[PDB]
Design a protein around this nucleic acid. Structure first.
Length: 159
DNA sequence: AATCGGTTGTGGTCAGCTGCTGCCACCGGTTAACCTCCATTCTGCTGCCAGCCT
């Protein structure tokens, strides 16, 4: 499926350019690896081509995905558990899934709650992580000028 | 003429509570997928085991 030069999305790290395809040997068989150059912390990720779907690597979403995530990002009736730990584990396991809709849900919930009160060290760190990978995936989805994409996200969040 | 003590017109003044009105430290209680063991030398005492005695 994957080709050299494709821009795929890794689950917990956001965008990833597939820059080469290695052919390393483990247990005497040439399981080909693909190397991904993510840029969040400048790490090179190597995965087999077989377990790409098992680890859940995923192509970027289309314009139906864009209107779907904007539709879910502008939606009310988002009642949350009042317990701080329950809420934290809930949106952490939403963030770790790798779905654009779930990441947009986490950034809209924490954005409205930060606009309300301003939460915490851990939740501001989580909102920064989630919003930066959502901005990176959006800029990958439309080739649309990083930090101007941030202004786009701020505008569609503030509405 | 002064001279040792009062009276005080009047203008600041200066901190001493007094509310008072936030507001900010400080301390207690709560959170419910699941996962169960860290150098040498001298002196004295205390415990070890064989070895004669009834």
């Amino acid at each position: 499926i994957f080709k050299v030069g494709d821009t795929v999305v890794y689950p917990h790290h956001g965008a990833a350019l597939v820059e080469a395809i290695e052919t390393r040997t483990i247990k005497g068989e040439q399981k080909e690896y693909l190397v991904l150059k993510v840029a969040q912390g400048d790490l090179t990720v190597r995965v087999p081509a077989e377990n790409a779907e098992y680890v859940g690597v995923r192509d970027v979403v289309g314009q139906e995905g864009l209107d779907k995530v904007f539709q879910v990002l502008r939606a009310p009736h988002t009642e949350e558990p009042t317990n701080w730990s329950r809420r934290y584990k809930a949106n952490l396991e939403k963030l770790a899934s790798g779905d654009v809709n779930k990441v947009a849900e986490v950034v809209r919930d924490l954005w409205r709650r930060d606009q309300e009160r301003g939460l915490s060290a851990g939740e501001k760190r989580m909102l920064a992580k989630a919003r930066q990978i959502l901005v990176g995936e959006l800029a990958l989805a439309e080739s649309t000028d990083d930090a101007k994409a941030e202004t786009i996200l701020d505008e569609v969040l503030a509405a």
